[PDB]
């Protein structure tokens, strides 16, 4: 509260190890999918049905440019790639395997640099 604070987390690593995180899921294998925004003119009923796309490419322009605030908004936006790829294509697919692939990746590393 007002003149009370928790002790002072070192946060000022964060974006480089981001960065990191990101360098490592845009180089997996399975990543293919995630790439590159998905085409909305290309893939019928993505559009409508995806209130939020998001991409690694996407991701990697805000975090170049400062446009996540801490490191949470980051992990938001990557889970949100995975929760997209979930709702538009079965688990028994290609892509849907590969997203599930990769968030497990992704949770790992998380755990692993910063819990």
């Known amino acids: 509260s007002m003149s009370v604070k928790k002790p002072k987390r070192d946060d000022s690593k964060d974006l480089a ?15 293919w999918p995630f790439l590159l925004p998905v085409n909305l003119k290309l893939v019928p009923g993505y559009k409508k049905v995806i209130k939020k796309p ?26 949100l790639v995975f929760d ?3 709702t538009f294509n079965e688990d028994d697919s290609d892509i849907g395997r590969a997203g599930h692939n990769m968030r497990k990746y992704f949770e790992k590393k998380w755990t692993d640099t910063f819990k």
Not at 18 to 24: F, N
Not at 55 to 77: C, H, M, V, W
């Open 17 to 31: 190890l981001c960065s990191m995180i990101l360098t490592e899921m845009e180089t997996h294998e399975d990543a």
């Open 54 to 79: 998001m991409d690694f490419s996407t991701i990697r322009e805000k975090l170049s440019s400062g446009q996540y605030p801490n490191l949470e908004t980051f992990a938001l936006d990557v889970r």
């Open 84 to 86: 997209n790829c979930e």
